[PDB]
Amino acid sequence: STGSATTTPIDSLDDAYITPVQIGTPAQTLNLDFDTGSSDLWVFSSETTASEVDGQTIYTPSKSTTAKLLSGATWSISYGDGSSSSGDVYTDTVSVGGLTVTGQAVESAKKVSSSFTEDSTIDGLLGLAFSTLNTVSPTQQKTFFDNAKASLDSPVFTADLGYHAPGTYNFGFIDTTAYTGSITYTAVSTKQGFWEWTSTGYAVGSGTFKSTSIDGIADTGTTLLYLPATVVSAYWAQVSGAKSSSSVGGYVFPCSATLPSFTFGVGSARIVIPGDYIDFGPISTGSSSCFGGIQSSAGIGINIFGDVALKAAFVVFNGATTPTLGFASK
Numbered sequence: 001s002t003g004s005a006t007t008t009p010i011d012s013l014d015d016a017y018i019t020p021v022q023i024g025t026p027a028q029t030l031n032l033d034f035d036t037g038s039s040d041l042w043v044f045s046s047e048t049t050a051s052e053v054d055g056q057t058i059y060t061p062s063k064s065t066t067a068k069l070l071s072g073a074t075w076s077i078s079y080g081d082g083s084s085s086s087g088d089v090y091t092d093t094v095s096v097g098g099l100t101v102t103g104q105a106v107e108s109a110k111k112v113s114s115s116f117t118e119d120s121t122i123d124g125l126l127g128l129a130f131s132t133l134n135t136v137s138p139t140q141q142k143t144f145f146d147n148a149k150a151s152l153d154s155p156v157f158t159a160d161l162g163y164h165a166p167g168t169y170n171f172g173f174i175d176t177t178a179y180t181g182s183i184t185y186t187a188v189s190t191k192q193g194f195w196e197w198t199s200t201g202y203a204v205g206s207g208t209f210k211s212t213s214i215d216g217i218a219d220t221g222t223t224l225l226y227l228p229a230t231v232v233s234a235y236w237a238q239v240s241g242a243k244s245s246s247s248v249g250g251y252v253f254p255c256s257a258t259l260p261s262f263t264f265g266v267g268s269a270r271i272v273i274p275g276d277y278i279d280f281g282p283i284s285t286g287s288s289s290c291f292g293g294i295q296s297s298a299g300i301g302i303n304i305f306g307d308v309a310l311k312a313a314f315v316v317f318n319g320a321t322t323p324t325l326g327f328a329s330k
């Protein structure tokens with residue numbers, strides 16, 4: 001079997017991506033944020049504290065004839081950005097573009113953090129990292145991709161994020177018309193439960209390629225590209241007027257700048273992120289200072305190849321016996 005759905009940026013900045021998901025019987029469609037950095041399928045629901053709901057579509061488990069309360073199961077997750085959500089668990093039918101999973105754990109949120117309430121376009125998350133990170137207690141649950149794995153034509157899922165445009169999430173197949181050149185595959189470490197790989201280096205604009213091992217995760221649930229301070233300082237040094245702002249909390253640059261591109265290495269292959277992808281608009285409404293899409297991972301502890309990097313490539317999350325990652329120019 002296969003599944004195919006359109007993913008759309010939530011705003012003019014591509015701050016996040018949403019993909020329609022069908023839950024329950026009859027179908028309740030919610031626009032979820034597919035996150036390859038986490039492993040909980042959680043949704044805004046009829047149980048979420050009223051004041052914490054602000055325009056999101058809710059899942060009403062009592063209106064689904066296939067929904068069953070998972071007795072004694074609770075979940076609570078904390079994200080790298082400081083956001084969090086938690087609640088109880090149900091099992092129900094979930095579908096993504098024709099691909100269906102019966103008895104999938106759907107995590108019903110009783111409480112969400114302010115930044116989830118403030119994003120009216122995101123009805124919850126669909127975790128695509130390894131199931132070892134799933135927070136359901138006392139009995140850990142599997143991911144959507146984990147549950148569908150054996151039924152798929154090929155045990156893979158592809159991410160084709162658009163720049164200021166719709167894109168695609170495919171399950172069980174590789175669309176050979178969706179990219180140019182070949183797909184280059186790289187090793188993955190599943191020790192931290194993330195799609196963790198090692199980049200062979202970088203170049204800034206038309207600059208000389210620096211061969212250096214950069215360990216990081218392929219994360220669709222993170223907006224920006226987080227890289228080591230040395231790499232990031234080399235990039236921003238090419239932008240006249242750019243600096244690191246303590247008040248803003250990162251690198252900022254004059255909105256009138258034409259940003260250089262950024263290349264990352266995938267084995268002997270190269271992925272070019274165009275300059276426009278690194279512009280995240282004014283730091284505050286009306287300001288002539290713009291926020292950068294390339295930031296230092298010094299305070300994080302791990303490098304993150306988020307949407308800024310991933311949207312420049314056709315990305316294969318290969319769930320074979322030994323998982324790998326595939327990257328191609330598009």
Ligand SMILES: NCc1ccc(C(F)(F)F)cc1
Nearest residue numbers: 079081083115116119221222
């Ligand atoms: N990295 C996971 C994640 C995804 C979305 C959000 C936000 F922005 F919706 F709160 C926070 C954290």
